[PDB]
């Protein structure tokens, strides 16, 4: 029952309908963006990867409700422990598989992170997360394979925090776009 994307196209278009208003429907666009059986052949132009780090590829601005990026993970890269600077945050798994771990967020005192929720995200699946929910980490589990993973964040942003496992303590963090539309950034 729920609206099936043919072709990521299609999941662009709904989306910009599903963000065209003031309230946003969670578990829709959710429902949605999993029901997108991931293509390699729609989204290769986006797959761009890097020897070392993980790569930020944009996809589409949203009309300025969204971002939608693909996001390249090497044979073993990871993300920081990291927030999502008051968005909503939509995650499918295009290739691959990635392992969330979801951290509680730190007080004031110096302390070692407190794990709240550790698991792998399945083919084509699509996970949320926001603020109110918690921090994370997201990790391709292979050394062998990458992982490759489409991102809404809603409203859009471009600075969060990374966080220290041992501490707790935070880092204003910019983040940067690796290619944009298909095409390498300077
Ligand atoms: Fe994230």
Redesign the pocket.
């Known amino acids: 029952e729920v609206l099936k994307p043919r072709t990521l196209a299609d999941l662009i278009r709904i989306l910009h309908q599903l963000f065209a208003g003031d309230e946003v429907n969670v578990e829709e666009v959710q429902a949605i963006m999993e029901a997108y059986e991931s293509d390699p052949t729609e989204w290769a132009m986006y797959a761009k990867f890097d020897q070392y780090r993980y790569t930020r590829n944009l996809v589409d601005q949203g009309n300025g409700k969204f971002n939608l990026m693909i996001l390249c993970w090497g044979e073993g890269h990871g993300?920081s422990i990291?927030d999502?600077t008051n968005s909503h945050?939509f995650?499918k798994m295009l290739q691959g598989n990635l392992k969330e771990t979801l951290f509680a967020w730190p007080d004031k005192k110096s302390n070692e992170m407190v794990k709240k929720s550790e698991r792998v995200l399945r083919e084509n699946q699509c996970a949320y997360?926001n603020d109110s929910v918690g921090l994370?980490r997201?990790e391709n589990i292979s050394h062998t394979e990458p992982a490759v993973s489409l991102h809404l964040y809603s409203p859009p942003f471009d600075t969060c925090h990374a966080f220290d496992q041992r501490t707790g303590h935070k880092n204003k963090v910019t983040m940067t776009f690796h290619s944009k539309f298909g095409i390498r950034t300077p």
């Open positions: 993300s990291h999502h945050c995650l997360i994370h997201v």
